[PDB]
C-alpha cells in the first residue's frame, strides 16, 4: 500500500507518533517519505545480508526477524513480514522502540540525510489531521 502524504500523517498521529519522545509528527512523515516513498511493501536487501522492511525500512539485523539474517537480534521481537502490512501498527510499535534508544531517529539514514535539520513540519502542513 502506498500512502498519500496527508493520509500517512493522519494515520501516524492516530498511532501516537506526534511528539513521541521529543519528535514532531513531521519527522515521521518525512522519514517514511525518504525511507520508502510511503510504500508499506518496500524492501531493500543490504550488503550484510540484512533487509530493510516496510514503510519505515526497519532492518532485519537488529529489529525484526526474517529468518535470513546472520547476526540477527530481533530487538522488536516481531517477524519482519509483520512490518510489510498495509496496517502500520507493527512498524510504528517497532519504530517507537528504535527511537527510544539513545541514537533516536538517527537510526533512519534517509531521515538523517533528508529530514534532520530540515523544516519537517512542512510534511504535515496542508493536511486534514
Amino acid at each position: 500500500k502506498v500512502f498519500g502524504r496527508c493520509e500517512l500523517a493522519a494515520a501516524m498521529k492516530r498511532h501516537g507518533l506526534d511528539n513521541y519522545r521529543g519528535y514532531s509528527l513531521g519527522n515521521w512523515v518525512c522519514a517514511a517519505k525518504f525511507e520508502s516513498n510511503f510504500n508499506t511493501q518496500a524492501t531493500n536487501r543490504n550488503t550484510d545480508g540484512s533487509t530493510d522492511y516496510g514503510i519505515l525500512q526497519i532492518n532485519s539485523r537488529w529489529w525484526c526477524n526474517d529468518g535470513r539474517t546472520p547476526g540477527s537480534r530481533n530487538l522488536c521481537n516481531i517477524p519482519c513480514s509483520a512490518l510489510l502490512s498495509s496496517d502500520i501498527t507493527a512498524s510504528v510499535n517497532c519504530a517507537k522502540k528504535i527511537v527510544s534508544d539513545g541514537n533516536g531517529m538517527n537510526a533512519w539514514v534517509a531521515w538523517r540525510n533528508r529530514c534532520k535539520g530540515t523544516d519537517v513540519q512542512a510534511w504535515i502542513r496542508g493536511c486534514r489531521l
Partner: antibody
Amino acid sequence: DVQLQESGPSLVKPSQTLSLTCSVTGDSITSDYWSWIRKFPGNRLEYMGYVSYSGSTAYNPSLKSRISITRDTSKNQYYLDLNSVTTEDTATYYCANWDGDYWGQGTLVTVSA
Amino acid sequence: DIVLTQSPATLSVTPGNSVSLSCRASQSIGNNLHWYQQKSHESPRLLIKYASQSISGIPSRFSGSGSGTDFTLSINSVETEDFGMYFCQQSNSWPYTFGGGTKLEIK
C-alpha cells in the same frame, strides 16, 4: 523462553549504595532493552530507568542522578545501583524488559538504620 | 512530567458484571498508554499495549480504548481472577509515569 530474576541484599542502611542484579535466562541481554521499576509502600509505582541495546540509558530525573544501570554480557545480567539511599528508597524492586512482557518476581529492599 | 490520574481509586464488583477503569493524562500522549494488572506478591502483568492493542495470552474480556488524554480499560464480565490492582502507564514522554492505580474488589 525468557525468564528474569532479581537478587541482592534485602536490608541496607541509610546513605549506602543499594545494588541489585537481574539475571536473564533464555536469550542474550544484548537482544533487548532492560529496565528497573519499583513499588513504594503505598501502591505507588515508579519507573526508574532502562538501558538500551546500545548501552545508552534513560534515568528518571526523580532519582536526582543517584541511579546507574549497567550490564554484563558474559554473565547475562544487568544491574541497578542507587547511591545515598534513605528510608524513602524502601520499596519492592522489579526488573522487566522494556516491552514489559517479561518481569521478575520482585524483591523487597528495606532501608533501615 | 506527565501525570496520570486514575479513577475511581477503588471499585467493587460482583463476578459476572462489567466494569470500566479510567485513566487521564495531564497532557496528550496519543495512544501511548499501557495497562497493567498487579496482584499481591506478584509483579505487574501487561494487559493492554498502546491504548487498545491486545496482548497474547491475556483473557479476551480485557479491552482498552481512548486517545489523547482520556483512556479506559474495560473488563467485560469480571472474573474472580480479575481482582487486584490496575495501573496505567505512559511511554510518550520520558520519564515514563504510572497512574495511582485502581483497586478492583469483590462486591
